């Protein structure tokens, strides 16, 4: 591994593995999987019912005390039965470490709101609802935060079109801004960039 | 080598010119039409054919790294001349 290759830290990998095993042991009721990546990141996979217990444990426990909510977001994977996965990123100032917690849901199953655990989660859950349509139960005030008033649909879903369905302009007859079906003078050009001759053998999937 | 349409418009190097019944001509009334006066085909046709005493010649368009990628041209066919795929320059062996 000469200078063009990224250096690998063994000590952090072992520490994160040990802490993941520790967290898995303490909460067997919810934790489903623990992973440590080759660039020293620890993410924990839990059941949806354990969002509040796991987050409260990670925030309040003396050994964890992850007091800072770095980010909360969602990822849309249409091929899964549970369409959306919910990702929590946490930072610990006491021990100078970062942890990730992943959850899953679909269109109709609500997720428990974590505003009681982290005050920062309010606007993040509002944005998740606005962009993906994931409902959060017991939220103080859940409503759109980014889309226009009266906007229909959720744009960050994979089946939503890039340019949407309606566009805006000014009409002199009605003397106001109106919404009409979208027509583009030049259609967005779609490029097929993926090549054959796979790049990374280490990620090859079984031929099923 | 700019030509003129029978109606009166200039013909571009790509050969574009609106036909007589075309309504889109109205965009040029009270205005002009943008046409480049220098045609690349005519300009490259005026270049002399280089004479080299080798079967294979290399061309980079002149200027080293300011030209095009370097390519090699075969000059065994005496019927025609070797033409650069990028620059359009022509090379030829000293026939007779």
């Amino acid at each position: 591994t000469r200078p063009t290759i990224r250096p690998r830290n063994d000590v952090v990998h072992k520490q994160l593995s040990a802490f993941g095993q520790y967290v898995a042991e303490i909460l067997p009721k919810y934790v489903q999987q623990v992973q440590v990546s080759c660039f020293n990141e620890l993410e924990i996979f839990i059941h949806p019912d354990g969002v509040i217990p796991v987050l409260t444990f990670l925030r309040d426990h003396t050994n964890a005390q992850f007091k800072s909510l770095a980010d909360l977001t969602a990822v849309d994977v249409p091929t899964r039965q549970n369409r959306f996965e919910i990702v929590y990123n946490l930072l610990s100032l006491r021990f100078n470490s970062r942890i990730r917690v992943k959850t899953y849901t679909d269109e109709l199953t609500p997720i428990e709101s974590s505003v009681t655990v982290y005050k920062a989660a309010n606007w993040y859950e509002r944005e998740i609802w606005d962009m993906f349509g994931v409902f959060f139960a017991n939220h103080p005030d859940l409503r759109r935060i980014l889309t226009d008033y009266g906007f229909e649909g959720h744009p960050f879903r994979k089946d939503f079109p890039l340019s949407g369905y309606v566009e805006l302009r000014y009409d002199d007859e009605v003397k106001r801004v109106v919404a009409e079906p979208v027509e583009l003078a030049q259609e967005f050009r779609k490029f097929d960039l993926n090549s054959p001759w796979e790049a990374f053998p280490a990620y090859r999937q079984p031929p099923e | 080598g700019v030509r003129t349409s029978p109606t009166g418009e200039k013909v571009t190097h790509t050969g574009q010119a609106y036909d007589d019944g075309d309504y889109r001509r109205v965009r040029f009334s009270d205005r002009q039409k943008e046409v480049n006066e220098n045609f690349a085909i005519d300009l490259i046709a005026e270049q002399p054919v280089s004479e080299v005493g080798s079967r294979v010649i290399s061309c980079d368009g002149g200027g080293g790294a300011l030209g095009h990628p370097r390519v090699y041209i075969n000059l065994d066919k005496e019927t025609k001349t070797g033409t650069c795929g990028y620059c359009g320059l022509q090379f030829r062996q000293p026939h007779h």
């Binding site: 800072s68 990123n89 005050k119 920062a120 889309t147 960039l193 | 990628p69 370097r70």
Partner: protein, 371 residues
Amino acid sequence: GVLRLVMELSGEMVRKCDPHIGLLHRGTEKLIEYKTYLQALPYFDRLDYVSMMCNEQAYSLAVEKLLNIQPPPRAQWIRVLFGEITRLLNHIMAVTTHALDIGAMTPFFWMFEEREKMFEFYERVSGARMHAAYIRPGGVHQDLPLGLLDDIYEFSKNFSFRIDELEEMLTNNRIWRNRTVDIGVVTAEDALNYGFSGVMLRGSGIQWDLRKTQPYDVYDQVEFDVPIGSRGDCYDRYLCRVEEMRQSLRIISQCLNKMPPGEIKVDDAKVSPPKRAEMKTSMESLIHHFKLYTEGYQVPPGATYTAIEAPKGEFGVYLVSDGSSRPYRCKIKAPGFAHLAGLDKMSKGHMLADVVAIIGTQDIVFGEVDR
């Protein structure tokens, strides 16, 4: 920027403050999914448009972590030098705009002259005054011109007097103090729980700085101090930002003195494009240039969360790779989001004229808040 602010007032006092955002929501995160990684790089220039190269650096670090490569040392030194220059730009903008909103309006011009000089540095290094796109996921695009370091040294040896004039105008003025002292006080526990970062944390006495605890490029090879507040008000945050300007000057001096020689992008033509002469003389170089500028480089599958100490706080990106040359998902973390979320709490029991001061001390730019 542009903000819609719905509030309830009982007499002079502000009872409730509800900010409405989305007036600059362009849908950047969905547009990124239709681009390659290099094609998606320039969006980060436009995300937080007061500190551009910092967003470039964050995105480049994320892509480098996913690619399992590292930039050459000279590239890292250039990145840190221009990050400190960009921090100076951002702090000038924040402080001068806060003063302008209060009503000073003279230091705005005084320091925007220096901002114009730093824009000249940007234009000389990349040909663009603000959205340079200089920091790439393999290093930097081009090497510095032969006379750039001398001009940077000439600029940076007179900036302390400009900061001194700013302090003479603002620091000890009684009107400025009565405008900023004991305004928008936030406790350390509330700051931590609400997701604050950067100066919003350090003004309450929390000792946290990502360049110190989790350094990324070469920040562990330079020494500097971290200003810490004591009361958690607007005045302490203003003092912290001024001290950060001085520390940025210190780091700039250190970077200027210790610039090493060598190449500027990783010597791996499957990630970084080759030189023009190589592309025009070598078959492999031409093939790699073609494939890098048409399809792009493939990134191994995986997800990462990379954060840097941006001038406005912790700026992070949650980048997800599916193994192709286009990102599957790109979530952007902006400190202004959490700061504007906490604005409602910070303006409890304050005058109507204090909301402007709180917004100014939060250092909010809506390009990163709305994305």
